[PDB]
Amino acid sequence: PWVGPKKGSWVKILRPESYWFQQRGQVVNVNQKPEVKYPVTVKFDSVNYANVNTNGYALWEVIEAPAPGPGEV
Amino acid sequence: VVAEAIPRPEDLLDSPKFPMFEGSTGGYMSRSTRERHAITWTAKGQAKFEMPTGGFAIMNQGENLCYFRKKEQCIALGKQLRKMKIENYKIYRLKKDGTVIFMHPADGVFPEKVNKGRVQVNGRPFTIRGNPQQSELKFTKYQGKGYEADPLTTMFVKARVMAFADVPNLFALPQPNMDELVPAEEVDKYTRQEYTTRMMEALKRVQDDRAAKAAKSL
Amino acid sequence: XXXXXXXXXXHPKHMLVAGVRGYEMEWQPIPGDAVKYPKPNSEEMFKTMIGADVETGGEAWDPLGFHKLFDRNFD
Amino acid sequence: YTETVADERLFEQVYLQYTSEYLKGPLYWHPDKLQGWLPDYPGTPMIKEGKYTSHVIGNLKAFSSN
Amino acid sequence: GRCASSRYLQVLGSIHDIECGFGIDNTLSLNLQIFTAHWGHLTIILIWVSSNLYHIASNANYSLWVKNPIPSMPIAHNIWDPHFTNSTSTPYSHTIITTILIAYSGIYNQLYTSGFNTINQIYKTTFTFSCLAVISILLAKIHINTHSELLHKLASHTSQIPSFFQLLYFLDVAISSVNIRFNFHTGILVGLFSIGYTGHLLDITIPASRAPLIHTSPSYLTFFGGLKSNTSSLYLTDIAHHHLAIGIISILTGHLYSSFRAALGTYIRDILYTSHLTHSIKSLHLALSLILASCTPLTSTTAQHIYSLTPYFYLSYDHIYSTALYVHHSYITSFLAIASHAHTAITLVRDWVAPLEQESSSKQIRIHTHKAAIISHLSWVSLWLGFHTLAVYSHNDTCIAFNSPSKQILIEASNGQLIQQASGKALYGTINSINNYNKSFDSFIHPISPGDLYVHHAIALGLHITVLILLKGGLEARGSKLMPDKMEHSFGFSCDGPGRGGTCDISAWDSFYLATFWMLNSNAWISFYFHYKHLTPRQFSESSTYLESWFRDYLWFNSTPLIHGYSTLGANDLSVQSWSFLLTHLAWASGFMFLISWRGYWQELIDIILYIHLKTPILINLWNGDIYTPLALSIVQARFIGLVHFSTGLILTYPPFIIGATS
Amino acid sequence: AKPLEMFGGVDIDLEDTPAHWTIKASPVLEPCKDNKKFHKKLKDELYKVKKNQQKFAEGSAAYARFNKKIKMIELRETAYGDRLCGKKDGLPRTIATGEWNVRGSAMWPAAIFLYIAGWIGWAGRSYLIRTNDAAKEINIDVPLAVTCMASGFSWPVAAWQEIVNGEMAVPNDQIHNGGPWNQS
Amino acid sequence: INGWLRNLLWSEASQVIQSYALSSICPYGFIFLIGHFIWAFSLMFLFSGRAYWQELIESILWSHHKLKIIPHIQPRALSISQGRAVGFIHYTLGGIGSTWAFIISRLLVLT
Ligand code: CLA
Ligand code: CLA
Ligand code: CLA
Ligand code: CLA
Ligand SMILES: CC1=C(/C=C/C(C)=C/C=C/C(C)=C/C=C/C=C(C)/C=C/C=C(C)/C=C/C2=C(C)CCCC2(C)C)C(C)(C)CCC1
Ligand SMILES: CC1=C(C/C=C(\C)CCC[C@H](C)CCC[C@H](C)CCCC(C)C)C(=O)c2ccccc2C1=O
Ligand SMILES: CC1=C(C/C=C(\C)CCC[C@H](C)CCC[C@H](C)CCCC(C)C)C(=O)c2ccccc2C1=O
């Protein structure tokens, strides 16, 4: 039984200290081990100050938002 | 792991373990400092390297030994050696008395390689944003150090933050009766377990009085 | 089959906006003014309101879209 | 059984939900719960049901609307 | 292990940060320390007042200035400096007589208006104020003992129940109580102090200004207006009536909160809870911020209205008093204004509890929800004002350099003119309905020209940018996108490292440090505007729309007497002014290196110097550096020291120019 | 009772009629063609330029260029005659009361600039929306760029139609609000 | 030092400061003013760190994202080294321009 958002599905970030808070990014993969605290891996078009466009988030920090659309983060 | 017998640098003049190095003013300042750090390693060929204190050096085909004032210089030289595929280098801190403390490959395995028996020191079980607010821990153990709070205290203050926003359902603390309480401390009735029962009944009386007073014009 | 996330590991989302009470509270009791929780319906109820006539079209005549600004307040 | 991160999060939620209700009661006694602090004065509730209670208008609370 | 040379700077950077004290464990200790410090500060103020009164009494000429105030000049104090010429005579003395300094404070007019006539009265006043300083220190001791006695009475204190620990929160109810403090401040300290000063005026000031009159009858309360013709100041009867009205109003207002009895007055907490506030009133930083934000309009209006409506005898007749007072109070109120924002930021860092993420209940919460909108719009208005003021000034400069004064863009200041016209119509309607008309209001309404419009836009730009920096620092003190953990660190800290793009000047204290430059610049603009309009209203009205006029006809032109002060031709009584001018230039430039050059360079330099000292023959056998190790100043200390040098230079370079230009 | 001396030099209208709300009724200002300072300033301009002109040869090109400059100065003098200037400076003023019908009014430049500035901003926003990529910002798609630049003329209508139809703004819950200020 | 201030930077600056509408030396007075402006402008880069400007840029970028104006070349404040370089360049350029105008206008007037 798959857990978390599907691969390639857009999710809105709910981590307040994240550089992409309330932004959206494609789900690269979700780790299926229940022991992993932050299994969801999300990649973004906008890099942060460390020039990193991907990060691993918790299961409770992604809400499966729709596609961004024209001129929308 | 067995610590070596690194002698004090002021007592090991002219040792065969010393690499051929040019020698500069950047070395440890004697006549003012007594704490020295020593790094030893075994090389395979006399490959030239750069001393952390200015000037270049040539290793020995066998054992090597260098003395430095700071652990940072020893670690810099260790990284430089490790770039040359030279493992098995150990870094010691020499106390003023001559006590040898084994520092860098502390358990014999380099810190970037996972080794069993290690425990996460200074670990915090939440995201960095999960730290409690500094304002909440005023005049407590963590007065200006909210990042040092144990996770139980963080959860407790988080629950307090959750609670102290539903203002209408809060309980105002009753005003103490200073004039008629406050006898000499020797004047007490003991019965500690009865004192909590007295707390229960007194708070029940306070709440009933408040409800009766509120149900007059509300 | 996607497993349902338990309420322990669910998400808060951002349905809780500045115009409504937060996690659990009550909003300030303002006297006669904008009260209660607003909901977007201006344009929709504007298309059912009468007043449109054949002088200008025959449907809800509102260039400049002044009706819709209530629905935009949320955006 | 091993304590997964979801189980730890569940304990977090249970602890917070219980304690946030407990601290509102008469058994926590924090300085922020004093009179003049966040909680209303004992016999004078100001706002209830999201409406100004009659005690807001002070000595006029007994006056009729007319 | 022990400390390095940076210990002194570290300690002195928080020498009065009583919250950061190590022995302090509770709000009782903090509040008592603050109360005792207040008593000591009041003692210092009283001693300063007695100082000025003594020096006017002893080393001065009040007895002679009072007779002929218009052409005479007051004396601050004598000059006793062994560095002067033991031969000849200094330019500050009448040949063989002692050396004197001309007072530019304004105390002479204050004492003359208040009713002083003789040196003996000033001497008795000095004695009384020294007595009051003694009284203040003794009150400090009294309150320390009373609170320690309450603490000792906790040796005979128990509630016989586990609720006894509640007394922990009420030990400092004497200091932390708000309703009683508000009631008694607003009533006594404001209203009854005003009423007592009305009594002082009616008993002394008005009797000792005119021929003998009736027994202080109620005819001493007039409603004339301003600028009594002979003394060119407000009517003392008008001042007494004003203080009486303010006193009555504030006495009535002072009965608002529940101070001494629970059956009278409304509580401040209930007032706030049913409004758009309900802030954390137990924070000392919040109270300090919002009362510093109160002394700011008071001091700014003091600066404005000491000049516009001169209240003291012959104050307008002194060309130096009027400018010095205005500039002084403008600088004081600018400092208090930036203080309010600094302590608001400290409040948000230290003494503010916020909901989880979304409970939009606190006012600070609602402000923080849309803080980005606030900062973006403040940036927009700042950019607009800067662009359109600098560009129009550049147009005027270019078109007047090109021999075309008529090609300038001169927007007539129509809105300010409309406000002035309405106020003038109101005042003229007041005057025309008087049997004792032909009154004057001095500079309450002044000629407004396009130069005034441009300078007002520049001042608005400066205020907007200062508020922008301070507000951004306050709102992002608890965390920004760049550093989303800023409330875990101190209010002031060095940086967040070179990584993540580089993070120099990231703390809220760094926002204050950046904003102090803009405060100084805005104050300089305001002071230049006032001083230029004071020196020559006509030339300012015509040629002030192009910045070259400000550069030439004001700075370059009016600096002639000051530089000529001491030269190879003799000295004037402006020699101290010129010497302090150059010294303050040196101080201003000296702080550039603390701001531009940063720590690591100097740390290497200090390591080299320390190498020398540990290498010099005799030093090495006496001092190995292990005790008070010399180190370069830390980053925050460096920024603060550079800021102090810059502020001192910029502020203290101006009074010499004012004195040289006006006197 | 002589408001000039009462208020330290400044004079007040003292009359409440709508006919004085125009800038032309102000006693501070005066039409430039009958102002002494205006005459003196432009006469001094003419005198200085003419004195410079005489310094050169009669038949030189510099003499002709100075004649052209003199003609420009005299044209400027006659063109600013209807413009209002202060009764003490002689420098013509710019009207910022929204008069719309006076010489030197700021309404026409304001309208022109606002139109063209909205045009620039709308063209840039349209290009950014239609090129949702960083590669298109460094290597500009010139045909699309000029298409948006030409299309920007209808900004005052298209922008409003997007504002009311929910296509310009975005809810705050879709963009990064800012740094966290709380959590615990 | 007062001699340098008075007889060099003040008395000998009369030519450049009073150079408006004077045919040859108008640009020198204007460039004197511009050099002062540029020199003072350098201090914004010299005294400030890049973190404040980065946070301000993020605040502005919020308003840009609000109206669907997303610069995909993400706006970042100048790097620390670049901030120092810009400050130094503006400082030296403005000061050199100030001296340049001051000396050249005076020598052109006197000659
Ligand atoms: C006018 C401002 C000013 C002043 C005075 C200085 C002064 C100094 N700088 Mg400096 N600097 C400045 C601006 C200034 N800087 C700026 C804007 C920058 C740009 C970043 C730098 C960058 C800089 C660097 C990079 C270096 C210096 C260095 C130096 C030192 C070498 C000169 C020296 O030792 O003379 C002595 C100092 C004086 C001020 C001369 C006058 C001394 C007074 C007049 C005599 C004594 C007064 C008397 C005792 C009164 C007693 C005090 C009183 C309380 C009793 C000196 C402390 C160099 C250094 O430290 O190397 C040695 C160095 O490496 N500076
Ligand atoms: C950010 C914009 C801004 C700010 C902060 C100020 C600030 C100030 N202005 Mg001001 N002004 C502005 C823009 C601004 N102005 C513009 C665009 C004009 C037209 C050229 C004027 C014309 C003007 C005059 C004539 C006078 C002032 C005065 C003043 C001062 C007193 C306050 C007042 O009455 O202003 C009025 C308030 C405003 C102007 C706010 C308007 C803000 C909008 C958004 C600016 C853009 C409007 C836009 C261009 C209109 C286009 C119309 C077009 C569609 C036809 C104060 C310092 C007075 C003064 O200093 O006298 C001593 C005065 O007499 N202003
Ligand atoms: C598509 C272009 C574009 C658009 C539509 C906007 C729109 C806006 N900007 Mg802005 N900005 C831009 C580019 C743009 N900006 C650039 C390139 C910069 C870097 C200098 C800035 C820097 C900037 C600041 C610092 C601030 C704004 C602010 C604002 C807002 C208020 C209006 C304002 O201040 O304008 C004035 C705009 C400027 C002063 C920047 C210069 C304008 C540039 C040069 C226009 C470039 C357009 C581009 C070349 C078009 C090419 C089209 C082609 C490829 C087809 C508004 C939402 C303010 C804000 O957030 O308040 C709400 C604010 O404080 N902007
Ligand atoms: C608000 C006031 C103000 C301010 C801030 C400035 C700012 C400036 N002016 Mg300036 N100026 C002003 C008013 C002002 N001016 C007025 C009213 C006049 C009268 C017209 C002038 C006349 C003037 C002239 C004529 C010159 C300046 C220069 C300068 C620049 C100096 C920059 C620098 O690095 O100096 C660094 C300072 C120095 C290197 C020292 C020079 C000044 C001293 C007195 C020389 C004495 C040398 C002596 C032997 C001791 C030297 C010590 C040694 C260790 C360095 C700077 C842009 C100068 C410039 O372009 O650069 C120098 C310049 O040529 N200004
Ligand atoms: C800062 C400070 C403070 C203080 C302040 C003050 C208050 C000061 C003072 C000062 C002073 C106030 C000083 C004084 C001095 C004096 C003197 C020095 C005197 C002497 C005298 C004598 C010696 C006498 C003698 C005699 C006798 C014995 C009797 C008879 C007569 C004769 C004369 C013989 C406080 C506390 C806040 C705290 C912190 C610090
Ligand atoms: C000049 C300079 C220094 C050097 C200044 C130092 C090291 C301190 C200078 C102190 C002066 C020389 C006075 C020394 C004090 C006296 C010896 C009196 C002692 C008083 C104590 C006993 C309290 C820095 O360390 C520094 C650090 C970071 C950014 C910029 C700079 C910077 O510009
Ligand atoms: C203001 C400032 C910024 C912000 C300034 C930036 C980002 C400059 C870039 C803005 C544009 C791209 C510059 C382009 C030129 C100007 C728009 C116009 C210059 C020419 C005019 C006269 C026409 C920093 O990033 C910074 C970083 C480190 C230390 C200090 C500072 C610093 O002081």
From the candidates D17, D52, D53, which should be mutated to test the interface with C, based on the most C CB atoms within 10 A?
Answer: D52
- Tokens found for residue E480: 């920004």
> E381, E509 in Cβ contact below 8 A?
no
Q: Chain C partners of F173 at a C-beta cutoff of 8 Å?
A: 14, 17
CA-CA distance, E329 to E312, in Å (whole number)? Answer: 16
Q: Is F175 on the interface with G (CB under 8 A)?
A: yes
This PDB structure is determined at a resolution in Å of 2.7
| Nearest-neighbour CA in chain E from F122: distance (Å) | 18
Please report, for residues E511, E528, E548, E555, E583, the alpha-carbon distance to residue G98 in angstroms, rounded to integers and kept in the order given: 31, 22, 14, 16, 23
Helix (H) or strand (E) holding E469: helix E450-475
Q: What is the DSSP letter of F84?
A: E
Neighbouring residues of B190: CB distance < 8 A, sequence distance ≥ 6: none
Q: Chain A partners of D2 at a C-beta cutoff of 8 Å?
A: 35
* CA of E133, nearest ligand number: 5
* HEC assignment per residue over E66-121: CCCCCCCCCEEEEECCCCCCCCCCCCCECCCCCEEEECCCCHHHHHHHHCCCCHHH
Question: Does the beta carbon of E599 lie inside 6 Å of ligand 6?
Answer: yes
* CA of E384, nearest ligand number: 2
Q: What angle do CA E369, E371, E376 make, to 5 degrees?
A: 140
User: Which DSSP string corresponds to D18-61?
Assistant: HHHHHHTSTT---GGGSTTSSSPBTTB--EETTEE-GGGGGGGG
Question: Does the beta carbon of E135 lie inside 6 Å of ligand 6?
Answer: no
CA-CA distance, E300 to B63, in Å (whole number)? Answer: 77
β-pair partners for B63: B42
Decide: residue F39, CB within 10 A, 0-12 exposed, 13-18 middle, 19+ buried. Answer: middle
φ and ψ at residue B189, rounded to 5 degrees: -95, 5
Q: How was this structure obtained?
A: cryo-EM
Q: By alpha-carbon position, which residue is closest to atom 47 of ligand 2? A: F110
Query: One-letter amino acid identity for E459?
Result: I
* Helix/strand/coil for E307: helix
**CB atoms near residue A57 (< 10 Å):** 23
From the candidates E500, E503, E504, which should be mutated to test the interface with A, based on the most A CB atoms within 10 A?
Answer: E500
CA-CA distance, E30 to E175, in Å (whole number)? Answer: 10
Q: What is the DSSP letter of B100?
A: E
Best of E547, E551, E553, E578 for a ligand 4 pocket test (most atoms within 8 Å of beta carbon): E551
- Tokens found for residue F121: 């901003």
| Nearest-neighbour CA in chain F from G70: distance (Å) | 7
Question: Does the beta carbon of E233 lie inside 6 Å of ligand 5?
Answer: no
Neighbouring residues of F146: CB distance < 8 A, sequence distance ≥ 6: none
φ and ψ at residue E506, rounded to 5 degrees: -105, -25
| Nearest-neighbour CA in chain B from F181: distance (Å) | 9
Calculate Rg over the CA atoms of chain G.
Answer: 20
The single residue listed with the structure tokens 């153990």 is B141
* CA of G43, nearest ligand number: 7
Q: What angle do CA B85, B88, B93 make, to 5 degrees?
A: 125
Q: Is F128 on the interface with G (CB under 8 A)?
A: yes
User: Which DSSP string corresponds to A9-56?
Assistant: -EEEB--TTSTTTT-EEEEEEE---TT-SS-EEEE-SS--TTS--EEE
Nearest CA among F144, F12, A63 for reference residue E425:
F12
Q: By alpha-carbon position, which residue is closest to atom 4 of ligand 3? A: F121
CA-CA distance, E548 to E451, in Å (whole number)? Answer: 13
> E603, G26 in Cβ contact below 8 A?
no
- Tokens found for residue E330: 């403008």
Nearest CA among F184, D30, D31 for reference residue E283:
D31
Helix (H) or strand (E) holding E149: helix E119-153
Spell out which residues line ligand 7, taking CB within 6 angstroms: G 44-45, 48-50, 53, 77-78, 80, 83
- Ligand 4 centre to CA of E582 (Å) is 12
Q: What is the DSSP letter of B176?
A: P
Nearest CA among A54, G54, A21 for reference residue F176:
A21
Atom of ligand 5 minimally distant from the CA of E130: 12
Give residue E192's region: left, alpha or beta (phi > 0; psi -120 to 50).
alpha
CA-CA distance, C35 to C28, in Å (whole number)? Answer: 9
Nearest CA among E56, E51, E106 for reference residue E78:
E56
Question: Dihedral sign, CA of E254, E259, E264, E267?
Answer: positive
Q: What angle do CA C14, C18, C24 make, to 5 degrees?
A: 75
| D near F: at least 3 beta-carbon pairs less than 8 Å apart | no
Q: Chain C partners of B165 at a C-beta cutoff of 8 Å?
A: 22-25
Neighbouring residues of E62: CB distance < 8 A, sequence distance ≥ 6: E56, E74, E108, E111, E116, E119, E122
| D near G: at least 3 beta-carbon pairs less than 8 Å apart | no
Question: Does the beta carbon of E593 lie inside 6 Å of ligand 1?
Answer: yes
Q: What is the DSSP letter of E60?
A: S
